Amino acid sequence: TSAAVPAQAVAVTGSLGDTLSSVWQTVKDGTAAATAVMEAVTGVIDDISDAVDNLGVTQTVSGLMGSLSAMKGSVTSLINQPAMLASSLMGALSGVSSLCDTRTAFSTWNRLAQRFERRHAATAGRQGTITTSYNSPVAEKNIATLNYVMLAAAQTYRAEAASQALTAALDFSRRMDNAARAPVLDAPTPPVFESVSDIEKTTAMLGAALDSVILTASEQGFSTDSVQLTQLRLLVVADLEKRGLQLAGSES
Amino acid sequence: HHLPETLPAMVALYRFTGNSRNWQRLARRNGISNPLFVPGGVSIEVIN
Amino acid sequence: TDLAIIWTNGRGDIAQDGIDMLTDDSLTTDVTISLFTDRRALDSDTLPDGSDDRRGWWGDSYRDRPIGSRLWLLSREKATPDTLERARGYAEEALEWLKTAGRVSAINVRAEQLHQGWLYLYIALTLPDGSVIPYEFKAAFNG
Amino acid sequence: AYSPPTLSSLIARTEQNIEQRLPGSWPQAREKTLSAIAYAQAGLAAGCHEHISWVGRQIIPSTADEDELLEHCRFWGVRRKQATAASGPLTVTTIPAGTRWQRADGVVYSLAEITVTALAAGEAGNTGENTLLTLITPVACVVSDAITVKGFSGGADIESAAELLSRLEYRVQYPPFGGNQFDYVRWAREVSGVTRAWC
Amino acid sequence: SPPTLSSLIARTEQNIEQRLPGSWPQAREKTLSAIAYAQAGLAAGCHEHISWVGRQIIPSTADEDELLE
Amino acid sequence: DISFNAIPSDVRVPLTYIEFDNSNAVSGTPAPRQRVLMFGQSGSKASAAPNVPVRIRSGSQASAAFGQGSMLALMADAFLNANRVAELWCIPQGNGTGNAAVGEISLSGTAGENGSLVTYIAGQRLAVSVAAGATGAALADLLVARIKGQPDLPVTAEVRADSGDDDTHADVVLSAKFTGALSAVDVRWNYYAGETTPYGIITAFKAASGKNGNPDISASIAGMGDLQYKYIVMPYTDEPNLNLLRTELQERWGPVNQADGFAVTVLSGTYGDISTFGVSRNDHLISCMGIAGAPEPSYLYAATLCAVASQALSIDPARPLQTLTLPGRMPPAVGDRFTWSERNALLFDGISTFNVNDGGEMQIERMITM
Amino acid sequence: MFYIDNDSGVTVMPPVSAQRSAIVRWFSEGNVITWPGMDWFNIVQAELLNTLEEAGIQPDKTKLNQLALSIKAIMSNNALLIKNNLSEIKTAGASAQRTARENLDIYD
Amino acid sequence: MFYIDNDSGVTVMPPVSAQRSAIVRWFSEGNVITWPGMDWFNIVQAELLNTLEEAGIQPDKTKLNQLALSIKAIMSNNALLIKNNLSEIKTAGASAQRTARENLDIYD
Amino acid sequence: MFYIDNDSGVTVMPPVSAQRSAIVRWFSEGNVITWPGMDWFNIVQAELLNTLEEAGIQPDKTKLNQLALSIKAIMSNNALLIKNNLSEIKTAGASAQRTARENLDIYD
Amino acid sequence: TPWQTAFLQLLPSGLAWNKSPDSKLSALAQAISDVIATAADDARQMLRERFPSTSRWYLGEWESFLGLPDCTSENGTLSERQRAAANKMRMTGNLSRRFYEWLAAQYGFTVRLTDSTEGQWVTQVNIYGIKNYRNATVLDNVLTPLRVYESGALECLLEKYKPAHQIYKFVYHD
C-alpha cells in the first residue's frame, strides 16, 4: 500500500534509535578508543553538515547548521550519554528531511546514502588484520553499530522519498482533465521518476540495497531492526510496482 | 466431537464450525500444548 | 509465474523441469485449481457420502472467496439429465469469478453423456485481446 | 519475540515475499498455487510460535503446569503426598489374610474388633457410622453382614498443585538452623510425647 | 546463539535440494529460491522467539518482571 | 405396528398404552422388505440355541442373547449403529477346532516421567496413566483391571509375574472368548500421532503360532428356512464354507426358487493372498473386500460394509457405491495401504477395494462382484 | 555383550533428535572442538546390531568376527553360490525350473 | 543422518594425519591414557557413509538398518538371487543369454 | 591406519570384561551420564579390522572405501556374478556343467 | 515425519492435489517443514536447559551467576561441572556430622566423621574408597583422555564449608 509507508518509516527509525541506545557503551575519556569514537562521530556529523550545506544554496538553513555545529562542539558530552547521542542524531536526520521538497528529497537522500555506504564498506572490509588486532573491541563495536544505523536510516528515508515522489507524479497526471471541451484563448516529480525503465532500475536498486541492509542487520543491530526493514521493503517495493508501473491498465 | 485423526487446530475448527479465525480458543480450552497436533481419539469441545 | 499442475493417473501434482519445478503464467493453472478443489457445501445440501462432513479449506476464512468448485457433490450419480444440468450449473458458478473480472469475456459450458459411463463437460472461454497464450497439455497415465 | 506475530500478518508477509521474489507480476484476481503454499507455511509458523509460548510459560514454578511443576519438585528434592487408604474397626463377632469385606456401594475393605484397611486410597473410603459390610468370600465361621458401629476414617486424596507449590516455596526459602537454646527446645519438643523442654 | 538469516537461507536451500534430487534452488529469480527465502524468514522469526524464551532462565539476564518473580 | 395381543385380555379399564422406538422407518408401512442374515460364533453362556435364526432389535438384546463380547454380538452392534432401516436375523454357531490361546503381552518397568500408556487390544484403546516411577507389575495390574472392567472386548486377561522383581517383565496372558480362525487379535500401542509411551517402558507382544478352523455351516444353511434374505454377511473366508454358501445361493437366484441373496465379506491378508483368493472364487453373488493392516478384526468391517451397502442400495438400486464412508471404522496405517496401481490391479481380480479420505474416514471406492 | 555393559547405559534407547544440517559434517579438534554425543554412538551401535540381527546371529562378547559371519550368512541366505551348482534354485520347486529355462530361452 | 548433526562440525573434512605406528594399537583406560581424536571417528564414519554411497542409498536419520539394506543392495546389484531365478542375464540382453547357454554347453 | 594413530595406543589389546547385563543397553545423557570405555571402542575397531582382514585386504590409512571393497571381494570370491555369466561353472569342469544341466532337467 | 503430515493437512483438500507419500508435494513438504522441526527441537531442549543439572548451552551463565568455578568443580569434565552447579544451587544445611557425611557423599565420595583423637574440636574425616579416576562421558570433548586423574577435590571442599570454630583432621583408608 501507499498510505502505510510513513508509519513503517517512523517505526524503523524508532527501532534503530532504540537499538543504538541499547548497544552503545561508555569508554574511558583519555584513551585511543575514546579518540577513535570521537573521530567517527565527528565524521558522521561532518557528512550530515555537508548535506545541509548543499541544501542551503537555495534556502535558509542557518538554524540547522548552528544546531549541528553545537552538537559537533559538544561531542565528548554525548559519547558518555548514549540516549542523548542517538536521539540527537535522529533529530538531525529528521531536520534534514524537514528542508527537502519532493523535487530534491530523493537526490539528497541518495547522496547521503552513498556517503554513508562508503564509510560502512571501508570500516567493514577490514575484519581480520594485525593492525585491527591493536584496536580496542568496544570501540570497534560502538563504531560499527553507529555506521550501520546511519546507513539504514538514510536508506529508509530514501525509500519513503521515492514513494512520495511517485505520489506527486500521479497527482500531476491527475491534474489534467479528461472530458471533451473546446479550446479558449488564455490570458493570465524528479526526472528519474518519469520514464518506465528508470523506474525499473530504481526498484531494482532499492530492493538490492534494502536486502543487503537486512542481511547485515541479521548480525549487528539484529532482532526488530531486521523485522522492520523487511516489512518496509515489502511495502515500498509493492507500492513502486503497482503505482509506478501501473501493470493493470497499461497495454503494450 | 471426536477426531478420526490428529489435525491442526485450524483445520479441526473449520471442519466443525466453518470459521477458522478463532483457532487459538479451541487449543486453549482443550488444553493442548502444540495446536498443530490436536489429539484424535479423545473428546474435543468445539464452540460454534 | 507459479508452479503448474500436471495430471497423471487422474490426480494432479506439481512437476519438475531441468533444474527447478515447471512454471506456468497462464489461465490453465487458475482454471484447473478453480475447478478441481472442493469448496464448502451449503447447510442444506445432501452430501454424496453417508457422512456429515463438508470439504473446503482452512484458508477460506482468510482468502475473501471460497476456493474451488462444488463438482464433488456428483461423486456417485446415475445416468439422468438432472446430474448433467447440475454439473453445468456447478461449473458455471465455479468459473464465473473470472467473468466477474476482466480476465475472460464469455463462458460457454455444456454437459453430455459420451460413451456409456462418461460425464463429458465442454467448457469454452473467450480470452480477451491482451491475454497471454495459455498452457497446453493432456492427461497422461503410466504404470 | 515477546509477542508472536498474528497469523494474518504472517500470511500477508509470506505471500508478498514470494510474489516480489518471483520474476513476474501476479494479476489482481488469481488462484496461483504458490498462495496455498504460503498459507500452509504461515499456519506451520503460527503453530510453532504457540508451542514456543507454551514452552516459555514453563520455566518458572509459579506459572508452570502440573507435569513441569513435578519436574521442578523432583529437581529440588520435594516429594508429593500420595493418597492414603482409609482404615478403621469392623465389628463382627461369632481367617485368611486376604479376607475382603464389601460395602454396599462396591468398594472392598481388606484384612492385613479387627482394624481393616480399604483397598482404595481415595476419599471414597471415608464412611459414616452404622454402615454394614458383606463378605464376598465366605469364611464358614461368622455371618456375612457386619455393623461397623464407628465409621471409617482417614482416606485423603492426592496432594494438590497449590499445596505442592507452597511446600516447594517453603523448602527453598527456609533458613539453616544451627545450635541454639531455642532450636534445642524445638528439637527436643518435636519428639512424640515430650510436651515441655528447657535448654 | 540462534542461526543467522543467511545461514537459515542456506539450510532451507540444502533441505530443498536434498529432498528433490537433481535440483539447484540457489538459481536467481526462481520459484524454489523464493520459497526458500520465505521459509527462512519465518524460521528466523521463530528462532528469535526461542532466544527470547531463553535468556530469562537465570535472574542475571532476565527481564524486569521475570527478575522480580 | 402394535400387536392386538399387547394388551392382556384380563383388563377392561381404560389403559393408554405407550411405546418408544428408534428406527428410521418413518411410514410404518411394509415397503419391499430387507432381511439381512448374519452368520457368526457365540461365546460361552450364550443362552441361545445354535443354528436357528433369531430376530434382534438392539445391541443390548444381542449381547444378552449371545453373551458379552461374542463376535456375533460385536457384529450386530456394529451393523445396528450404522443402519437402522433393515431387519436383522442372526444365526449363532459353535466352536472351531483350535485352542483359545491368542498370545501374551510383556511389559518392563521403571518409567522415567509422567505419561499415559495406550494399548489397542483389538481396535479398542485402553489408556492407563503412568506415574513418575510406576513399574511393569503395577502397569500390568492396571491393564488387567481395565480389561476385566470392560467386557465388550473379545478377550479375557490374566497376570503372570517373573523372577526379575524390578524391571518386572510382567506378562498379560490373553484368551479369546470364541475359538476359530477369527480368534486372533492385533496390538498397536501407538496408533495416532501425538500418542507415545512414557520413556523407560518396554512393551512387546508374542502371538501363538497354532492354527484354528472355522465352524461348519451346513446345519445353519439347512436351518436358514424358506425366506428371502436379501444380504448375507457370513464372515467365514474359508473354502469349504464358501463352497456350501455358493451352492445354496446358486440354488437360489434360479427361476424355480425365486429368493435372492448376496454375501459381503472382508479378507484380512497380504497382497498375494488377497489376489489369489480373488482369482480363485469366480462367482457373482459374493463381493469381498481385501484389507492389509486392519487394526480391527475383519468381521467388524464386514458388518459395517453390509450396513452401508444395504442402506444405499435399498434407497436407490441404480446408484453407484463409489464414495461412501464406513461410520467409525479404523483404517490401516499409512504404510500398509495399497497404492493406486495396486488397487487398479486388484479390481481386475474381483476383490473390491477401499480408500482413505482427507480425514481419517475410509471410502468404499468401488464394489465389484467376484 | 556388544552393547554398553559398563553399567552406564539405559535399557530403552532415547529418541533421536531431528535432522539439523543436510550436508555431511565431520569432526574437528581446531573453530570449535566437536563432541560425539549420544546420537552418534547410538546410531553406530544400532546399525551394527541391526546387521547382526538381520543375519540371524545373536551377539556375543567373546567373538570378534561376527560382522564377517553376518555378511557370510547374508550371502548364504540371499544369493547364488558357486559350490551349490544351482541346486538352491532347483530344490525350491518345478515352477522355478520352468521359469529359469523359459528365461534362458530353453522351451519346447 | 548418520553423520554428526550437532552444531559442532565442519562441512569440509580435516585431512587425516600420516602413518605413525606399523603395529595395531588399541585403547586403554589405565599403561598410557588414550584419547580418541578426530581421525578414528572420521575414518569409521567415512567407511559407513561410503558403504552406503556404494549401495546407492542416501543416509537418513530415522532409519537404523541402512547398513543391512546396503549389504542387501550390493548383493542384488552384483550377484544373482534365488528369488530372481537368473533374470539379470535376460535383462542384460540376448548376447548374455547366448553366452550363458554357451557356458552351460547347450549347442544347436 | 584404521587403528589409533595418536601415539597413545597399546600394542597388546587389553582383555575385555565379562557379560554383566542380559538385555541391550543404549547411550544416554540424563539416571547417570554414559561413558563409552575402552571396551566399546576396542570391539568396534576389532570388528572392522576383522572383516577387512577376512575379505583379504590389509588395512590402510589413505583409502576410505575399504568396507565397500571388502564386501565386493567377499562377493567375488564366494558368489556368482553378473558380468561373469556362467564362466565360473564353465571353469569348474564338465562334471559341474552336467550336474547343472541334469538338475535343471535338460537331458536325454 | 509428523511435521510433513501437518503441512500436508494444512494444504488444501481436493481432487487436484495429490498428498500420497510419494508425490512431489510430499517431497517438498518434508524440506519445507524440517526447518520448523529443528526449531521445535531447540525450543524443547530449552526445557532441559531450565535446570543447571542438565544444561549444556547455559553452563557458562549458570556458573557465572553462581560464582561456581572453584575447587569442587573438576578439571574439564562437563558432568562434574554440571554436578557442582546443581549442588551449589541447592546447598543449604546445618553443621552436624550427619549432614556433612551426606553432603560429602552427594558428590560421589565416601567419608565418615569420627570422634577426635587428641582434643574435642578436632573431628576425624575418615575417607574410604578413594578413587581419583573420572571416566570421560559422551558429553565432554573429543580430545579429552579416556580417564582424567584428579586429586584433592574433597579436601578443600570440606575445608571451605567446615564450621568456623572447628578444625578437621583427614585420614585416608582403603
XYZ file of C-alpha atoms in Angstrom, chain A residues 52-233:
182
model
C 22.722 20.528 4.816
C 25.231 22.923 3.240
C 24.445 21.551 -0.221
C 20.743 22.004 0.562
C 21.271 25.583 1.752
C 22.194 27.101 -1.620
C 18.534 27.976 -2.246
C 17.012 28.053 1.263
C 17.912 29.299 4.742
C 19.470 26.505 6.816
C 21.205 28.619 9.474
C 19.316 27.140 12.431
C 20.070 23.538 11.498
C 23.692 24.419 10.731
C 24.025 26.039 14.155
C 22.477 23.026 15.873
C 24.897 20.734 14.032
C 27.817 22.983 14.991
C 26.795 22.849 18.658
C 26.438 19.061 18.533
C 29.889 18.786 16.932
C 31.334 21.064 19.610
C 29.811 19.049 22.468
C 30.919 15.593 21.273
C 32.664 14.491 24.476
C 29.490 15.050 26.499
C 27.422 12.996 24.042
C 29.771 9.993 23.924
C 29.288 9.188 27.611
C 25.487 9.505 27.407
C 24.098 7.034 24.839
C 20.424 8.070 24.795
C 21.157 11.725 24.020
C 23.550 10.793 21.202
C 21.049 8.618 19.322
C 18.142 10.977 19.995
C 20.106 13.969 18.689
C 21.314 12.065 15.617
C 17.795 11.015 14.633
C 16.530 14.528 15.339
C 19.203 15.873 12.994
C 18.169 13.388 10.305
C 14.545 14.490 10.667
C 15.678 18.118 10.499
C 17.480 17.387 7.237
C 14.303 15.738 5.950
C 12.281 18.801 7.019
C 14.098 21.007 4.473
C 13.606 18.711 1.467
C 10.932 19.305 -1.151
C 9.570 16.493 -3.306
C 11.966 17.634 -6.051
C 15.240 17.275 -4.127
C 14.459 14.693 -1.423
C 15.433 11.648 -3.483
C 18.639 13.292 -4.715
C 19.875 14.445 -1.307
C 18.991 11.158 0.386
C 20.740 9.223 -2.395
C 23.858 11.342 -1.882
C 23.755 10.785 1.887
C 23.213 7.046 1.405
C 26.257 6.835 -0.868
C 28.354 8.854 1.586
C 27.445 6.573 4.495
C 27.879 3.437 2.359
C 31.462 4.461 1.598
C 32.297 4.628 5.314
C 30.448 1.417 6.171
C 32.212 -0.554 3.434
C 35.607 0.904 4.361
C 35.196 0.063 8.053
C 33.697 -3.396 7.428
C 36.155 -4.613 4.786
C 38.951 -4.788 7.386
C 37.845 -7.695 9.563
C 40.997 -9.671 10.343
C 44.289 -7.778 10.296
C 47.336 -7.456 12.529
C 46.581 -3.722 12.658
C 42.953 -4.383 13.611
C 44.284 -6.520 16.470
C 45.567 -3.316 18.101
C 42.160 -1.610 18.126
C 40.009 -1.948 21.230
C 36.957 -4.219 20.854
C 34.371 -1.938 22.475
C 35.420 0.996 20.278
C 35.089 -1.145 17.148
C 31.633 -2.331 18.210
C 30.463 1.201 19.046
C 31.735 2.385 15.651
C 30.262 -0.438 13.555
C 26.809 -0.167 15.131
C 26.741 3.598 14.557
C 27.793 3.181 10.921
C 25.126 0.553 10.247
C 22.394 2.576 11.965
C 23.247 5.717 9.994
C 23.240 3.781 6.715
C 19.904 2.108 7.448
C 18.231 5.380 8.435
C 19.443 7.052 5.240
C 18.158 4.186 3.081
C 14.734 4.162 4.764
C 14.359 7.909 4.250
C 15.356 7.476 0.597
C 12.676 4.812 0.084
C 9.983 6.977 1.675
C 11.076 9.906 -0.506
C 10.773 7.714 -3.608
C 7.224 6.715 -2.670
C 6.305 10.369 -2.102
C 7.778 11.300 -5.497
C 5.587 8.651 -7.132
C 2.553 10.122 -5.366
C 3.443 13.625 -6.576
C 3.872 12.432 -10.171
C 0.497 10.684 -10.123
C -1.139 13.821 -8.707
C 0.422 15.844 -11.532
C -1.051 13.385 -14.031
C -4.454 13.571 -12.300
C -4.433 17.382 -12.507
C -5.315 17.460 -16.216
C -8.961 16.910 -17.147
C -10.243 14.175 -19.452
C -13.590 15.485 -20.724
C -14.123 16.821 -24.229
C -14.105 20.633 -24.259
C -13.385 23.454 -26.725
C -10.149 25.464 -26.531
C -10.231 29.014 -25.198
C -7.862 31.950 -25.544
C -5.772 32.166 -22.378
C -4.663 35.401 -20.716
C -3.283 35.495 -17.130
C 8.496 14.784 -9.728
C 12.202 14.245 -10.331
C 13.133 13.411 -13.934
C 14.388 9.979 -12.837
C 10.787 9.079 -11.895
C 9.193 9.809 -15.294
C 10.297 7.004 -17.627
C 9.432 3.341 -17.092
C 12.890 1.782 -17.497
C 14.178 4.338 -14.989
C 11.505 3.181 -12.535
C 12.533 -0.442 -13.120
C 16.181 0.405 -12.424
C 15.226 2.359 -9.297
C 13.115 -0.522 -7.978
C 15.941 -2.997 -8.572
C 18.456 -0.747 -6.806
C 16.175 -0.150 -3.811
C 15.378 -3.842 -3.438
C 19.025 -4.901 -3.612
C 20.151 -2.194 -1.178
C 17.477 -2.977 1.406
C 18.089 -6.727 1.092
C 21.794 -6.175 1.769
C 20.953 -3.935 4.737
C 18.677 -6.636 6.178
C 21.391 -9.259 5.696
C 23.858 -7.047 7.581
C 21.302 -6.329 10.328
C 20.963 -10.120 10.793
C 24.232 -9.761 12.809
C 24.921 -6.228 14.210
C 21.712 -4.492 15.427
C 19.593 -7.664 14.994
C 16.001 -8.618 16.035
C 13.326 -5.909 15.432
C 15.728 -3.811 13.276
C 15.670 -6.511 10.526
C 11.953 -7.432 11.009
C 11.086 -3.755 10.411
C 13.372 -3.315 7.393
C 11.883 -6.393 5.707
C 8.383 -5.011 6.217
C 9.423 -1.571 4.892
C 10.789 -3.172 1.674
